[PDB]
């Protein structure tokens with residue numbers, strides 16, 4: 001009841017947006033339940049939060065063909081990948097919060 | 099000549115501070131040359147940068163016993179680890195950056 005995730009499926013990746021409701025401590029990273037996704041497809045991760053929340057999640061999806069992290073100015077930046085894209089490639093995404 | 103790294107060794111982790119000087123594009127992640135460290139020891143990562151820089155570096159040390167990311171309010175938060183600490187544990191380190 002303190003952290004919501006939205007998941008959106010795409011031809012080429014699963015998007016994960018997280019929202020923080022109540023303020024959080026890091027212990028949360030032991031409790032939190034990470035959305036399960038299509039492994040055959042890479043992952044983009046967005047949300048306003050501490051870098052640690054982002055990194056934690058990012059590593060969590062490290063088996064997928066790639067992981068990218070959202071930056072309002074740029075899109076999703078691939079930070080690691082096994083199969084499809086390269087570190088530093090930028091997927092063209094915009095995320096609107098109403 | 100756009101991104102500097104400092105390394106500081108400790109009994110229990112290698113600290114990596116990174117600094118950005120020129121503004122950066124994400125292409126940089128293909129070039130960046132990461133400080134090599136004692137694998138037997140975990141790693142703490144401090145620096146101001148985009149999430150992506152943090153995550154990128156963090157993942158880069160993913161073999162070490164753990165990786166933690168510095169947060170001025172809290173300390174170094176373990177975000178992944180193989181051997182020593184737990185995700186969400188907070189190493190109780192203070193980092194102050196002396197300006198000028």
Ligand SMILES: [Mn+2]
Pocket residue numbers: none
């Ligand atoms: Mn794990």
Ligand SMILES: [Mn+2]
Pocket residue numbers: 062
């Ligand atoms: Mn890997």
Ligand SMILES: [Mn+2]
Pocket residue numbers: none
């Ligand atoms: Mn790699």
Ligand SMILES: [Mn+2]
Pocket residue numbers: 160
């Ligand atoms: Mn691993």
Ligand SMILES: [Mn+2]
Pocket residue numbers: 183184185
């Ligand atoms: Mn754990």
